[PDB]
Design a protein around this ligand. Structure first.
Ligand SMILES: OC[C@H]1O[C@H](O[C@H]2[C@H](O)[C@@H](O)[C@@H](O[C@H]3[C@H](O)[C@@H](O)[C@@H](O)O[C@@H]3CO)O[C@@H]2CO)[C@H](O)[C@@H](O)[C@@H]1O
Length: 476
C-alpha cells in the first residue's frame, strides 16, 4: 500500500512591462527567473522523483523577452552600469531595493550590512552593492558554479559583475527548454493558467462572492466579463501549445479559485483536471476527504490540495531547521499513510518561487534533504499530474456543486470588498465598456487587486502605475 504524493509548484508574475515605454518597471521576473524558475525543475536532474509545474502564460511571455535580450529592465540597468554612470535616481533605487530585501536570509552578507551603515558610497562600494544584489538571488545551479565569487562577499569588479550577469542570462535562456525536457522525459507534468491569472469565478459571475461573504460590498458590474473569461483560457491554451506542441489538459485555477460556472468553463475548454483548495471541499461537501480523486458532474477531475502540508512548506518551514522540517513533513505523511486502508492521493500545491528567499540558503538544504529523503521512502510514490489523473488503485467520488472561493480563507476578500480594491474594479468596469484590445485582459490579473490597499505592499506605487497604464492602453 503506497501513499501517492503530488507536488505542483505554481510559477507566475504579472506583467511588469509598461505598455507605452516597454520598460520592465520591477525586476521580480528577472530575479525569480535566475533564482527559481530554472532551478526548481532542475532538481529533477539530481533526484529521481516526480515534480509538477504550473507556468502562467504572462510569465512565459516575460521569460521569453528576457531570454531574447529584449527586456528593458530599469532596475537591472542600474545594476549593470559602471557606478560612475549611475544616475542619482538609480543609486536611490538600488539602496531602496536593498533596504526592502535586507532582512531576508538570502541577503545575509556582512558586506551588505556594512554598505547600508555608510552615509555615502564610493564607486567600489557601489560595485559591491550592485553585485551583491545580483548574487543574493543566485539559484542552486549557479551557487555551485559561482561558489568562489559568492564566498568573496566583497571587493567585486565590473568584470566579475558582468560574468555573473552573463551566467544569469544563460540560465534564463535554458529555462523553457528544461520544462520541455522534464515534461518529455516524464519527470513532471506542466500545466498553465488562464492567461493573465484572473479570478475566473468573478469574471463569470461577480455575485459568486456572496456564496461565502454575504456582507461584502462590491461595485456595480454594469458590463459582462464572461467572454473575457473564455479568452483568458483560450489564449492560454494557445500559448502553451506554442511552447510544448500540445494543448494543455491540466490547468491551475488562479488562487485555487473555482465555482460551478468556472468548472463548466474549464470543461468546455477541454481541461481534464485541475486542483483547488481543501477549504473549498469543506465548504461544499459535509464529509469529504482530500485524499480522493473527485469528478465534478462527471465532466472534469478535481483534486483538493492538502492545505496543511502545502502551507507548512509555503509559510512555516522557513522558521525551522531543515532536517527537523523534513522529519516533520515525512512524519505527517506517515500518519496519513497509516490512517486509511486505501492509497491516498496527497496534493501539495503552492507558489513555486516565493517561500525560498526566507529559508536558510534559499531553501536548498531543505529541498535537497526533502527530495533525497522522498526518493528513498519505498512507501511513498511521487506522481506526475498525468499519473495522478489516470491512477486506477485510488479512491474516487462524484461531486455536483462547489461553493465558490479561493485558497485564501475560501473567499474573495483579498481582491474585492474594501474601498480601495473596489475602486480598482470600478475602474476596470468602466474601462471594459470602452475597451479596444487585449490590454483589458492584462488589467484583469489578480495581482493588481491583491496589492491595492493593503498596508503591506512593497513598490505598490509601481503596481498601481502598471494597472492604470494597462487600463488606459486598453481603450486606445
Ligand atoms: O513588490 C511586491 C512583490 O512582488 C513580487 O511578488 C510576485 C510573486 O513573486 C509572484 O509569484 C506573484 O505572486 C502571486 C502568486 O502567483 C499567487 O499564486 C498568489 O500567491 O498571489 C501572489 C500575488 O498576486 O506575483 C507577485 C506580484 O503580484 C516579488 O517577488 C515579491 O518579493 C514582492 O514582495
Amino acid at each position: 500500500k503506497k501513499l501517492f504524493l503530488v507536488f505542483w509548484w505554481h510559477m507566475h508574475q504579472p506583467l511588469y512591462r509598461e505598455p507605452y515605454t516597454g520598460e520592465y518597471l520591477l525586476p521580480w521576473t528577472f530575479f525569480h527567473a535566475v533564482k527559481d524558475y530554472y532551478d526548481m525543475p532542475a532538481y529533477l536532474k539530481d533526484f529521481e522523483i516526480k515534480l509538477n509545474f504550473n507556468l502562467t502564460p504572462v510569465l512565459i511571455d516575460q521569460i521569453q523577452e528576457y531570454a531574447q535580450g529584449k527586456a528593458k529592465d530599469v532596475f537591472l540597468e542600474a545594476i549593470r552600469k559602471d557606478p560612475d554612470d549611475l544616475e542619482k535616481e538609480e543609486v536611490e533605487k538600488l539602496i531602496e531595493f536593498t533596504k526592502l530585501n535586507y532582512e531576508k536570509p538570502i541577503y545575509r552578507f556582512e558586506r551588505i550590512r556594512e554598505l547600508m551603515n555608510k552615509e555615502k558610497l564610493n564607486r567600489e562600494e557601489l560595485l559591491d552593492l550592485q553585485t551583491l544584489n545580483l548574487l543574493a538571488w543566485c539559484g542552486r545551479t549557479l551557487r555551485k558554479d559561482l561558489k568562489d565569487l559568492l564566498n568573496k562577499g566583497r571587493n567585486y569588479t565590473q568584470e566579475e559583475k558582468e560574468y555573473v550577469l552573463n551566467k544569469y542570462f544563460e540560465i534564463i535562456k535554458k529555462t523553457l527548454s528544461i520544462y520541455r525536457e522534464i515534461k518529455e522525459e516524464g519527470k513532471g507534468s506542466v500545466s498553465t493558467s488562464p492567461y493573465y491569472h484572473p479570478l475566473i469565478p468573478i469574471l463569470l459571475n461577480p455575485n459568486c462572492v456572496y456564496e461565502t461573504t454575504p456582507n461584502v460590498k462590491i461595485p456595480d458590474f454594469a458590463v459582462s466579463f464572461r467572454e473575457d473569461a473564455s479568452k483568458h483560457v483560450e489564449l492560454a491554451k494557445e500559448k502553451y501549445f506554442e511552447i510544448f506542441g500540445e494543448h494543455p489538459v491540466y490547468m491551475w485555477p488562479p488562487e485555487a479559485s473555482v465555482s460551478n460556472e468556472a468548472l463548466e468553463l474549464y470543461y468546455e475548454k477541454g481541461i481534464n483536471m485541475l486542483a483547488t483548495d481543501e477549504v473549498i471541499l469543506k465548504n461544499s461537501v459535509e464529509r469529504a476527504s482530500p485524499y480522493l480523486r473527485y469528478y465534478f458532474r462527471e465532466l472534469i477531475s478535481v483534486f483538493f490540495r492538502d492545505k496543511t502540508l502545502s502551507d507548512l512548506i509555503g509559510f512555516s518551514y522557513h522558521a525551522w531547521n531543515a532536517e527537523d522540517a523534513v522529519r516533520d513533513f515525512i512524519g505527517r505523511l506517515k500518519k496519513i499513510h497509516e490512517s486509511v486502508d486505501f492509497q491516498p492521493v496527497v496534493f501539495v500545491v503552492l507558489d513555486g518561487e516565493n517561500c525560498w528567499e526566507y529559508y536558510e540558503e534559499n531553501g536548498i538544504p531543505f529541498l535537497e534533504k526533502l527530495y533525497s529523503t522522498l526518493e528513498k521512502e519505498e512507501w511513498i510514490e511521487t506522481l506526475t499530474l498525468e499519473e495522478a489523473m489516470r491512477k486506477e488503485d485510488v479512491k474516487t467520488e462524484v461531486i455536483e456543486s462547489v461553493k465558490a472561493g479561493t485558497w485564501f480563507d475560501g473567499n474573495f476578500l483579498k481582491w474585492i470588498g474594501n474601498k480601495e480594491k473596489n475602486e480598482y474594479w470600478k475602474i476596470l468596469i468602466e474601462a471594459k465598456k470602452k475597451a479596444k484590445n487585449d490590454y483589458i485582459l492584462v488589467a484583469e490579473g489578480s495581482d493588481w487587486f491583491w496589492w491595492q490597499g493593503e498596508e503591506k505592499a512593497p513598490f505598490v506605487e509601481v503596481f498601481d502605475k502598471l494597472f492604470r497604464s494597462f487600463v488606459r492602453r486598453a481603450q486606445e
